[PDB]
Design a protein around this ligand. Structure first.
Ligand SMILES: Cn1c(=O)c2nc(SCCC(=O)NS(=O)(=O)CCN3CCOCC3)[nH]c2n(C)c1=O
Length: 167
């Protein structure tokens, strides 16, 4: 099924690549095995990457997520769960980064990125780097130090992308 046809990425380390792109648009071109969603524990995909991914699935992601959460209860911070990737990928790895702004432990960003290690290749965003308030430079550094498998990072904003590549 999935083909993982990534292109245009800058190689930062042996297993970490980065691109200035829309993760929804990357997922449609790449057709990856796994696309990562930066979620909350209730899998309510209200905005950011999660809202954008859900919209691209025509709200199917939210319906499947609501069914999973009503059954199995919320996730743990730093935890994750594999659901369907719908039309974007084979699977979607919903990962919950810590809500740094609301006082959750930023050390859980290591546990959040350790969920990546169960998958050979992933298309992902920077965890907790949206409204959760984690410094994206710090989120990238935890990603590099923690992820051992192949991760292709999409950063939407160009200015932040240039900051990240230069750091
Ligand atoms: C279109 N598009 C974006 O919009 C976009 N945003 C980012 S920022 C990093 C990801 C992020 O938001 N992580 S988070 O802070 O943990 C989300 C917390 N939310 C709490 C409410 O429930 C949903 C989850 N990167 C983006 N890329 C690459 C992109 O392509």
């Amino acid at each position: 099924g999935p083909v993982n046809s990534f292109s245009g990425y800058l190689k930062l380390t042996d297993n970490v690549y980065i691109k200035n792109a829309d993760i929804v648009e990357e997922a449609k071109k790449v057709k990856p095995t796994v696309v990562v969603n930066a979620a909350n524990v209730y899998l309510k995909h209200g905005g950011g990457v999660a809202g954008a991914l859900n919209k691209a699935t025509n709200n199917a992601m939210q319906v499947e997520s609501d069914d999973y959460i009503a059954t199995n209860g919320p996730l743990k911070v730093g935890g994750s769960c594999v659901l369907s990737g719908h039309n974007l990928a084979k699977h979607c790895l919903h990962v919950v980064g810590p809500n740094v702004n609301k006082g959750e432990d930023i050390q859980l960003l290591k546990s959040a990125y350790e969920n990546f290690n169960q998958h050979e290749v992933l298309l992902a965003p920077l965890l907790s780097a949206g409204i959760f308030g984690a410094d994206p430079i710090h989120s990238l550094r935890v990603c590099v130090d923690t992820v051992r498998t192949n991760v292709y990072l999409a950063v939407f904003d160009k200015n932040l992308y240039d900051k990240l590549v230069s750091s």
